[PDB]
Every structure is written in C-alpha cells, then in structure tokens.
DNA sequence: GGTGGTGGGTTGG
C-alpha cells in the first residue's frame, strides 16, 4: 500500500497472505470469502513470463495477521491449500484478463475477531456502488513505495476512476473484467496499490447493510501512486458466474 | 450469512478511523 | 526465542 497508515486490529479480519513454504516468503495477498475459500489474483500463482507455476504443496495461506512477519502466536491460523482454481480463460500474455483465483483449504477455518470473512456483491450492491467517484479500501502488505517494506498491515482508500480515464491512462489493453481506481493529479490526495498488495481486497462497505463487500481485486499497474496512473483490479461481480460454478463443485 | 460484519467494528458497533470517510463519499 | 523487542500485545512462558 502506497501513502497508506497502518491497520486496526481486524479492520480487514477477511485480509490472507499467501506464504510461499521454502524458501520461506511472501506472494502477496488474498481475501476470505468462505470458511474453506480464500480468493485471490492469478498472476500470484502463475505468470509464464515471472517462471511461476505454484503447486498446492508449494504454498502457506496465514489469515487474521497483522505485524508482516514475526509469528503472532495464538491468533493467525496458518492452513494448508487442497485445491487451486485458476480461471481458464487468464489472459496472462496481454493484460492480466481476469485475473482471478480460488483457493479450496484442506479444511475450513474457526473465525475469531481477527479471522472473518467478507461479502461478495450481488446484482443490486454490484450496479448500486460500483459508481465513479465513489470510494472502496484497499488492503495488504505491499511495497510502500515502488522500488518498501512496512512491519504492519497497510490500509488505503481510494475513489473509482471512470472507464474513459483508465481506457487511455494506459497503451494497455482495458476491459470490463477490469477496473481502475486511484486519484487524479490535481487532486491533491495520493494513494495506490503496489506491487505485493496483489490478490488482496478492494473492498466497499454498504450503506444499506453495514456488510463488507470485496468489489475488486488487487491486479495490476504502472509504477505505484503515480500522477495520471491508477490501481487496476479485478472486477468481481463481472466473474461471479464462474465464482458461483467453482465452489458448487 | 454473517460476511463482512467485524466482531470488533459492526459486531461492537464500532466505526473505524475512516469508514465514516466511505460513507461521506456516498 | 519460538516470532519482535520489550511483559504484554492482539497471545504463554
Ligand atoms: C502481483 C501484484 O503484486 C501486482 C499488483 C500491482 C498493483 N499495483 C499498482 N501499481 N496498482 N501485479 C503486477 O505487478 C502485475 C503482474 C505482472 C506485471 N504487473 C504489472 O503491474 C506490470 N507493471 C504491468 C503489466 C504487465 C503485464 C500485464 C498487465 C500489466
Ligand atoms: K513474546
Ligand atoms: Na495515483
């Protein structure tokens, strides 16, 4: 998280670190939307280009964290993974296109109040908030800045760019499996997602229900926290059909 | 079920630093 | 330490 503060305890209680076992390291980030469900972005697990092709055996999922490492004791449940669901149709050649993953536990996982999971937007929430100008929170332990290390869970929020902004913000190829949010140069206010936030929940809380619901996905972008250039994630509800087909497995 | 309510923000009725910053912008 | 640098923490000795 650029230009970001530290988190409170369980501020995202639903917020997953993927740890890769040897050596011993961090991916990224990935989000609880189940008991025996984790989500997170594909590039995490596998991108060609990076030599990435993680196994089920080769990966930790530590939930309900919060200092970046040292082994909080009595409060993270660190599981291990039994199933990998990676979309089919990833386009991980061009622009990271649907950029998405699932992840079945061996077993589900006991919820404290530092382990609890988030919403996912229905028909209505999907159309009714995912309007520009509007603001969602964006977690996870990523660089501070773009080289950005910090020792504590990083908190930002930002307000969604519209589609014509983010089209030609980037020679990049943009769709609506995707979304950008960020702030404009002039105003004045900074933030961004960096990379090893990625997988981690952009999140936007109901005013209707005081529900969590997890909007985006912490894909990709240019730089970090950059004057014309915004955060680029996942847009859930635009999957939902394949999120529903997978976990009615 | 019982998503996306904190036990220690929603469950506590408890706001957050800057949930109320979320809120402002809707 | 195991997992930081201080006692508990947010969690035991
Ligand atoms: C894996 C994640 O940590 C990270 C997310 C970065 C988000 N931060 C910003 N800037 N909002 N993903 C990446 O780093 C992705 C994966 C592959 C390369 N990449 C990029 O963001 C590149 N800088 C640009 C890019 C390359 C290929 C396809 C899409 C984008
Ligand atoms: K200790
Ligand atoms: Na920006």
């Known amino acids: ?249 | 079920a019982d998503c996306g309510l904190r036990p220690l923000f929603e469950k506590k009725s408890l706001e957050d630093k800057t949930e109320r910053e979320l809120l402002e912008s809707y």
Not at chain 1, 132 to 140: E, F, L
Request: charged share 25%; proline share 6%.
């Open chain 1, 1 to 249: 998280i650029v230009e970001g503060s530290d988190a409170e305890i369980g501020m995202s209680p639903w917020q997953v670190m993927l740890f890769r076992k040897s050596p011993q390291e961090l991916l990224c980030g990935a989000s609880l939307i189940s008991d025996r469900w984790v989500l997170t972005a594909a590039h995490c697990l596998l991108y060609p280009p990076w030599d990435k092709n993680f196994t089920e055996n080769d990966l930790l999922v530590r939930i309900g964290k919060h200092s970046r490492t040292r082994y909080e004791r009595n409060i993270e449940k660190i599981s291990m993974l039994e199933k990998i669901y990676i979309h089919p149709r990833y386009n991980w050649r061009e622009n990271l296109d649907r950029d998405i993953a699932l992840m079945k536990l061996k077993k589900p996982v006991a919820f404290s109040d530092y382990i609890h999971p988030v919403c996912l937007p229905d028909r209505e929430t999907a159309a009714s908030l995912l309007q520009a100008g509007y603001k969602g929170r964006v977690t996870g332990w990523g660089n501070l800045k773009e080289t950005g290390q910090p020792s504590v869970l990083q908190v930002v929020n930002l307000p969604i760019v519209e589609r014509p902004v983010c089209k030609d913000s980037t020679r990049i190829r943009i769709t609506d499996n995707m979304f950008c949010a960020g702030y404009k140069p002039d105003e004045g206010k900074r933030g961004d997602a960096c990379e090893g936030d990625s997988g981690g929940p952009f999140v936007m809380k109901s005013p209707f229900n005081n529900r969590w619901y997890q909007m985006g996905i912490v894909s990709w972008g240019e730089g970090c926290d950059r004057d014309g250039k915004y955060g680029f994630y996942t847009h859930v509800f635009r999957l939902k059909k394949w999120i529903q087909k997978v976990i009615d497995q």
